[PDB]
Write a protein that binds this ligand. Structure first.
Ligand code: UD2
Length: 321
């Protein structure tokens, strides 16, 4: 009999965010070799039939991770390091530390992940790059540069770097910056509203449905991503797999997605460096930076093929049962 997989995701059901997206995608990819279901917490009325658990976020799902560990000591637990666990919490957070100890396998979502784990956790760490469907690379206009950044506004997304680069470029009518994401963390949507009132090339569109978000990523000349940390951001692969090049903060989660040799990084929180890269992208339109970055992004794009992710998850499942 095939395994009965439970995926634990701290996301609300139907949420438009990474943690829901990963859990739903993994359920789809694994369905040909197992019975798969997604929950927010474990156990539940259906818990007795589950044989394997993949739990997202070593802190946020720590109570379900421990429930599983105590019910199945030494068997069937994979803990998936989705971001603030790996790059924040495992530091000093006893829940995140326990989850790391209890897991039979740890999953990181790009090549650099295990560098952030304790050395005693590296032998059971597995890399599972995420995947996304491709979109046709669109030909685009040289008349203007249109940038997009995508992320629900929270401090970890360092939206202030974008706000500050948009402000440096306030008078540049030839450069447009669209920003997609809900107004989560206290007062970030107010900063975005004030900036869009002052600097008409900058627009904060609020949260948009995923279909519309993918279409805007495809249509933009460039995707800007400023975060302090990422587990392995969906929006970077969504751009890459649309033929939209990226400007990203030099933090491990981003470097793991775009490569050690990528020419499109700026130092974390350096608004001037980001504004300089946008000016260089614009200058090149008409040898140009956008073309250089498109070439580099096209070599990354096969990392994000769902067949690749499926094969990595099939291997992981066979290890856990
Ligand atoms: C560490 C961190 O800070 N973020 C992590 C978190 O995802 P996040 O939710 O922080 O970021 P993400 O970019 O991985 O995923 C956001 C998803 O929502 C979509 N979107 C977003 C806003 C909006 O208005 N419309 C829209 O469609 C976007 O297109 C993407 O598919 O979990 C993921 C795994 O599950 C990854 O590990 C991320 O790196």
């Amino acid at each position: 009999s095939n395994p009965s997989l439970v995926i634990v995701s701290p996301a609300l059901p139907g949420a438009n965010n990474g943690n829901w997206r990963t859990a739903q995608r993994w359920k789809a990819l694994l369905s040909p070799v197992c019975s798969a279901r997604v929950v927010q917490q474990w156990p539940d009325a259906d818990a007795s039939a589950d044989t394997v658990m993949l739990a997202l976020h070593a802190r946020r799902s720590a109570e379900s991770i421990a429930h599983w560990a105590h019910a199945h000591p030494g068997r069937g637990l994979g803990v998936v390091l989705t971001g603030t666990d790996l790059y924040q919490d495992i530091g000093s957070d006893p829940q995140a530390q326990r989850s790391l100890q209890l897991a039979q396998r740890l999953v990181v979502l790009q090549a650099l992940g295990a560098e952030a784990l304790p050395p005693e956790c590296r032998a059971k760490a597995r890399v599972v790059y995420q995947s996304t469907s491709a979109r046709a690379e669109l030909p685009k206009s040289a008349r203007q540069l249109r940038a997009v950044m995508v992320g629900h506004l929270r401090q970890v997304k360092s939206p202030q770097t974008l706000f500050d680069a948009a402000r440096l470029l306030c008078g540049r009518e030839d450069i447009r910056i669209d920003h997609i994401g809900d107004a989560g963390d206290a007062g970030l949507g107010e900063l975005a509203r004030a900036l869009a009132s002052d600097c008409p090339g900058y627009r904060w569109l609020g949260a948009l449905p995923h279909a519309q978000t993918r279409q805007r990523i495809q249509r933009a000349h460039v995707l800007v991503h400023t975060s302090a940390l990422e587990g392995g951001a969906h929006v970077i692969m969504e751009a890459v797999r649309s033929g939209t090049p990226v400007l990203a903060s030099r933090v491990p989660g981003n470097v793991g997605m775009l490569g050690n040799d990528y020419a499109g990084y700026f130092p974390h929180g350096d608004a001037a460096a980001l504004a300089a890269l946008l000016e260089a992208c614009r200058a090149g339109q008409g040898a140009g930076l956008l073309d250089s970055l498109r070439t580099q992004c096209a070599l990354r794009a096969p990392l994000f093929d769902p067949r690749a992710e499926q094969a990595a998850l099939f291997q992981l499942l066979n290890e856990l049962q």
